Each structure stands twice: as structure tokens, then as C-alpha cells.
């Protein structure tokens, strides 16, 4: 509670800031193609990425483009990260998640530009992209999107504003989305009413993820035993779900958040798991694997509907 005075002032900025939005004191500016914005209320996790490729798969027959911020990306300026599926830079220059993005998605185009519009400016000259995805883009309200998808987890409806919270804004921001996604349905299942679109998301194991990102049946380990790692901390996270999943685990070892692996040194002939975050930087390597999961979406031909409209 040390916390709440910085909560009550952050809530009067970001109110004024919304304020002066939400009248028109301040630009918003308008890219010539179609762009979704992908955002949450509180910081995108798993979920925003999950949703974000799920989006970009039902997309296919357009060309689509990723415009991401670029957080932990060394200094600023508009840089193409993956060109239709191949990646232009390593994931040190573009950060983790937009890397991670650029190799889910093999057809896809992926940008990593703080200011979002001058990354769908150099994305317009150099790729010619016919839909833009906002990548965490809820709070960028100096970009219009065409269609604004909130996601909010069963955790957020009972959050509060940073730093005492989670909550990057107020739960009345909700009115700004065109569509609700409710997410992490698998784990924590709840039901929101907006009178907006809404969609449940639950996400389910479907494959692995080998070291060249592509999906590999998890038969292999049909009658093997498997080491796993993790590095942020996310090892409880995988360490539950490697328990949820029932899968024989030999041995299991940690490290730091930012571990680099510039010295990880495996076993010829064994099996490793490890997180697609952490599989990155493991590339060369196989015989180390990460769990694919994909995206369930309730009323999945609804959204299909919502989207295809912003294209006339
Ligand atoms: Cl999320």
C-alpha cells in the first residue's frame, strides 16, 4: 500500500491523457490500409502473443504485417525485423517477442518502430503489407485502428492501477474496444458482459517446437524421458505445466530471466524442453524443443465477420 499514492496521481494523468483523446485535442493519425490493434488493460503476456499469431493465421490470404514497439530493442528507429517469414535481424537487434513473432509466422512481416505509424509508413514503401496488426497497441491512440481487440484476463477485473496494480489504465478504458477477447479460459475461466463482441480464448497443446520453428509431433518423447530449463523465473510456469502435461522429466534446471545461453552446453543423444522465449537463443540445436500451443476461440466465424469488414 506503500504504492497507492503513485497510483492515485497515475490515474489523473493517464485520465487527463485519455481526456484529451478521447475529445479530439490530440492527433490521431490514419495509415491508408486497414490496421487491428491488439492490446489488454494490463501488461501482454503469453496471451497478446498467442492471440496475435492466432489473428495473423486467419489473415493468410492477405499480406500481413506485424507492427511491434521493439521493448528491449537497443535505442529507437523504424527497423524491418522479418520480411514475409525471414527474418532481417537477429533477436538481439529486435528483442525477444518480436523475433519470436517474425519465427512463428513464416508469411508475415514483422516491424519494430516505437512510434507505430512510421513503421507502417517504411512497412507501406518497402513490403506493401494490405493489413497492418498492432502488436500491443490499446494505449497508441495516436495510430487509428480500424479494429481495437481488447484482451482481459479473469485477473484484471479485480486488478488496479500501477504501480499499486497492474493495470496500465482504468477499467472504464474497456469502452474504447470493438471487441473483447477473454483469455486464459483453459486456467481461469470467467464471463464478462459488454454488450461489445466478445470471444473466450482458451489456448491447448497442440505440438513441439523444434529448433528451426517448425512444428514436430511430441510422440518422439513417446517413450523417453526429458530434461527441461528455464530462465525468468517461468520455471514454476513450466514446471507446472511439463506436470500438468504428465510428462516424464529426467532432470530440471534454472536460470537467470535473461539468460543468453553464450555457453549452454547439451548432450548429444538427449532431449531437452525449454520455452519458445529461451528456444531463440538455442537455434542449432536439436534435440532441444519447445511446447506449441494453439488458440481456441469461441464464436471463431463472428470475429472472422468483424474482421473482413474493415476491408471495404
Ligand atoms: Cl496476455
Redesign the pocket.
Known amino acids: 500500500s506503500s504504492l497507492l499514492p503513485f497510483s492515485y496521481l497515475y490515474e489523473k494523468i493517464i485520465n487527463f491523457r485519455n481526456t484529451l483523446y478521447d475529445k479530439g485535442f490530440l492527433k490521431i493519425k490514419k495509415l491508408p490500409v486497414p490496421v487491428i490493434s491488439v492490446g489488454?488493460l494490463?501488461?501482454?503476456?503469453?496471451?497478446?502473443?498467442?492471440?496475435v499469431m492466432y489473428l495473423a493465421d486467419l489473415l493468410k490470404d492477405k499480406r500481413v504485417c506485424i507492427l511491434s514497439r521493439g521493448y528491449k530493442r537497443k535505442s529507437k528507429g523504424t527497423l524491418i525485423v522479418s520480411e514475409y517469414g525471414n527474418l532481417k535481424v537477429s533477436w538481439e537487434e529486435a528483442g525477444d517477442e518480436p523475433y519470436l513473432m517474425a519465427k512463428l509466422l513464416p508469411h508475415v512481416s514483422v516491424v519494430a518502430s516505437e512510434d507505430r505509424y512510421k513503421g507502417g509508413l517504411l512497412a507501406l514503401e518497402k513490403l506493401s503489407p494490405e493489413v497492418f496488426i498492432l502488436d500491443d497497441g490499446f494505449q497508441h491512440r495516436k495510430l487509428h485502428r480500424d479494429l481495437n481487440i481488447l484482451?482481459l484476463?479473469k485477473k484484471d477485473l479485480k486488478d488496479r492501477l500501477l504501480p499499486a496494480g497492474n493495470l496500465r489504465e482504468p477499467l472504464k478504458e474497456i469502452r474504447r474496444a470493438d471487441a473483447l477477447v477473454l483469455?486464459?479460459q483453459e486456467v481461469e475461466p470467467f464471463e464478462f458482459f459488454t454488450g461489445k463482441p466478445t470471444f473466450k480464448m482458451f489456448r491447448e497443446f497442440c505440438c513441439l517446437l523444434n529448433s528451426d520453428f517448425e512444428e514436430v509431433p511430441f510422440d518422439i518423447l513417446k517413450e523417453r524421458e526429458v530434461i527441461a530449463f528455464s530462465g525468468l523465473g517461468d520455471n514454476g510456469q513450466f514446471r507446472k505445466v511439463l506436470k500438468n502435461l504428465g510428462i516424464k522429466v529426467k532432470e530440471f534446471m534454472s536460470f537467470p530471466d535473461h539468460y543468453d545461453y553464450s555457453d549452454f552446453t547439451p548432450e548429444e543423444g538427449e532431449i531437452y524442453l525449454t520455452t519458445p522465449k529461451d528456444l531463440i537463443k538455442l537455434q542449432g540445436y536439436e534435440n532441444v524443443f519447445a511446447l506449441n500451443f494453439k488458440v481456441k476461440l469461441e464464436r471463431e466465424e463472428k470475429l472472422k465477420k468483424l474482421i473482413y469488414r474493415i476491408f471495404y
Do not use: E, M, Q, R
Request: net charge positive.
Open positions: 489488454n494490463s501488461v501482454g503476456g503469453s496471451g497478446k502473443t498467442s492471440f484482451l484476463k483469455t486464459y
